[PDB]
Amino acid sequence: IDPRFPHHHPRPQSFWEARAKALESLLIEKGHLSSDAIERVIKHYEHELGPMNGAKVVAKAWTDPAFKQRLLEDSETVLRELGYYGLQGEHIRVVENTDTVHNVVVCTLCSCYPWPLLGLPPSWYKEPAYRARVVKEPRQVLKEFGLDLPDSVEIRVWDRSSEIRFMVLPQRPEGTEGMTEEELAKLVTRDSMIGVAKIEPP
C-alpha cells in the first residue's frame, strides 16, 4: 500500500467478519452481552417478523371499509392496537395508492424501514442505486421492477429522513371477487407495500 493512496484499498469482507467476532467476544467477556441475548435478536428479525403482518393490514383494509377508514385517519393508533409496534415501528403511517397517485417509499440516507410491520427491507432497498435514483427518476426505477406508469399518474416518493415510517396500501386487483380476507392477504406482496409493484390479478 502506497501511503499516498490508502483510500484506494477497501477493507475486505473478512475484516468485517473478524471485527464482528472480536466485538462479540469482548462484549461477552466484559459482561455486556450474552450468547442468548444475541440469539434472541437474530430469532426476532430472521424469523418472527416479516411482511405477512403488513399483508394482514392490507387485506383487512380491503375487506372492512370501516377499518380502512380508521387506518387512514389515524394509522399509528390503529397499528399499535393490532400489536404491530416496536423498534423502528413506533410511528407508522399508511398512504393509499389510487388510480392517479402512486406512492413509493425510500430511505435515501440509509435504510429506514418499519421492521415491526414489514420485517427486514429488501436487499436492493438499502443499496445506492435505488436510494439515489428513486427520488429523481422514479419512473425509470419503477420500470426496472416491471411497473410502467403512464405520464398522467402522479408519483409521490416518501423519503424517510426521520423516524416516521410509511407503508404503502396498494389497490386490490381485479379477479378477486369472493375471496376471503385470509385469501386476499396471500396476494399482498412485500414489494407492493413499498410502492415498487402493483398487485397482479390472481
Binding site: 483510500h7 484506494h8 477497501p10 469482507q13 468485517w16 467478519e17 473478524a18 471485527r19 464482528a20 467476532k21 472480536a22 466485538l23 462479540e24 467476544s25 469482548l26 462484549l27 461477552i28 459482561g31 455486556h32 452481552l33 450474552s34 450468547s35 442468548d36 441475548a37 444475541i38 435478536v41 437474530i42 428479525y45 430472521e46 411482511p51 409496534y85 416496536g86 423502528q88 415501528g89 413506533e90 435515501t108 440516507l109 435504510s111 415491526p116 429488501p122 443499496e127 445506492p128 436510494r131 439515489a132 427520488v135 429523481k136 419512473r139 421492477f145 405520464d151 399518474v153 402522479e154 408519483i155 409521490r156 416518493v157 416518501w158 423519503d159 429522513s161 426521520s162 423516524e163 414489494d191
Partner: protein, 227 residues
Amino acid sequence: MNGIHDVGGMDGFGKVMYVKEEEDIYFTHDWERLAFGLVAGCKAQGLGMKAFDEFRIGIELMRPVDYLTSSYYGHWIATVAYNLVDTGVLDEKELDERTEVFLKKPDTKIPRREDPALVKLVEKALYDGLSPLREISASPRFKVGERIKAKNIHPTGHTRFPRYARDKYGVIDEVYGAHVFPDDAAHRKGENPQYLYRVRFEAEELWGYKQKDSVYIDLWESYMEPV
C-alpha cells in the same frame, strides 16, 4: 455531513438489482446475523448508542471506499465499533488485537454465557421501541400549506437534511410534533427537540424536471425559514 451516504439525486449507480421476494435471502453469512445481535443488544442497554442518531453518524463516518464495499451489515459492524470505542466501552487497541486474532484464526472459540435477565431486557426493547416524540413549550414556526425555504446549511456533523433538498422551496404537508434533534443528539449534545414537519417538494424545484413527481421529506424546524 455531505458524505457518501447522502446519495439522493446521484447518477451512475446503475440498475436496481431486482430479485423476487421469496428469493431475497436476509443473511448469507453468520457474521451478518451477529451484526444484528450486536446492534440491538448494545442499543437495548444504551451501550455506545441510545437511539439511532449516534448509530447513523458512525456509518456516515466510514471511509467512502469501505461504505461502498463492506456490504450492508458491514456498516453496522463499523458503527458499533466506532461508538463503543468513542464512548469508552471498548479500547481501540484491545479491539484491534482481538480483530487480528480472528483474522488469523477464524475458528477461535467464542465465549458462551447465558443471561436470561438480559434476554428479557433486549426483548422488551424490540417490542417497546423508543419513540423520539417529545413535547416542548414553544409553538410551531410553520403551518400546513406554508411555502417555506429549505435552507442552504452544511453541517459538518450529522444531519437528516439531504443535500438534494437544500436551497429549495417546499410546502408544509404536516406538523408531526417535536422530535429529538438528530444534528445534536448524534453527537451526544442533548435531545434538544424541535418541531418536525413533512414537506412536499416538486420535481421541477428539485431537479428542473417536467414529470408529475414529488418528494415528501421530513425536516426539522431549524432546517427551514419563512419566505
